[PDB]
Write a structure and sequence with these properties.
- Pfam families: Trypsin.
- This protein folds into 2 domains: 120 residues, Thrombin, subunit H (Beta Barrel); 103 residues, Trypsin-like serine proteases (Thrombin, subunit H, Beta Barrel).
- The longest helix is centred in the C-terminal third of the chain and has 9 residues.
- It starts with a strand and ends with a helix.
- The protein is 7% helix and 32% strand.
- The strands form 2 sheets. A 7-stranded antiparallel sheet has the order 1-9-8-11-12-13-10. The chain has a 6-stranded antiparallel β-barrel with strand order 2-3-4-7-6-5.
- By secondary structure, the chain is mainly β.
- It contains 2 helices and 13 strands.
- The structure holds calcium ion and magnesium ion.
């Protein structure tokens, strides 16, 4: 996350870190047995780490549970990143408490202008590499589809929305992929892609979760 702030330990209780010997993506807990992340974060051998703040220090509120199965969207396209969403089932149900909580799925899509909270352990430099150990947060508004499409001509589908600052300076970055974009108490986006990080006129692009609620509900109830 570039131009963000330190969230504070466990203030984003639904934030998950996907680990395959090291943190490689973020995710969101939707209920005790399931996590949603980005399909491009797919890997075999994932351990889900809940209740984290510093990912290099066991501070006492973590739960490390292995994934029993992963389901990438039936229409995910790795070339355009369209339908960039995946579901991960935990081998054991997590114990929800103050530090580990699930996030609600949206009943409707959010409007441009709505402020959201984006979080993750990704790079914090637009030009450079600095990986933080504690969770960083960023408040950013959803941008109009028109400013999103002018930034990325012929690359935005109805399953994506842009959030950020066209002036640049604040944005999600690598290591933040798969993490949450929460607006008004609902999970509305998933950190998907962008052009560099925090560049001018290059906002981040997010998977638009409101278009996948029936698929999520159906899939988790049948697995
Ligand atoms: Ca830790
Ligand atoms: Mg993240």
């Amino acid at each position: 996350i570039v131009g963000g702030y330190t969230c504070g330990a466990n203030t984003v209780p639904y934030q998950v870190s996907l680990n395959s010997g090291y943190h490689f993506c973020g995710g969101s807990l939707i209920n005790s047995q399931w996590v949603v992340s980005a399909a491009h974060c797919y890997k075999s051998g994932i351990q889900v780490r809940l209740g984290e703040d510093n990912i290099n220090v066991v501070e006492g509120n973590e739960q490390f549970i292995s994934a029993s199965k992963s389901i990438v969207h039936p229409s995910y396209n790795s070339n355009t990143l369209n339908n960039d969403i995946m579901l991960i089932k935990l081998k054991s149900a997590a114990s929800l408490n103050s530090r580990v909580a699930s996030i609600s799925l949206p009943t409707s899509c959010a409007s441009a202008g709505t402020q959201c909270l984006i979080s993750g352990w990704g790079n914090t430099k637009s030009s450079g590499t600095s990986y933080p150990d504690v969770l960083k947060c960023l408040k950013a508004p959803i941008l109009s589809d028109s400013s999103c499409k002018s930034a990325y001509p012929g690359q935005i589908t109805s399953n994506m929305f842009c959030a950020g600052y066209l002036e640049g300076g604040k944005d999600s970055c690598q290591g933040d992929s798969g993490g949450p974009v929460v607006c008004s108490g609902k999970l509305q986006g998933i950190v998907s892609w962008g052009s560099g990080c925090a560049q001018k006129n290059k906002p981040g692009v997010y998977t638009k979760v409101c278009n996948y609620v029936s698929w999520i509900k159906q899939t988790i109830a049948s697995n």
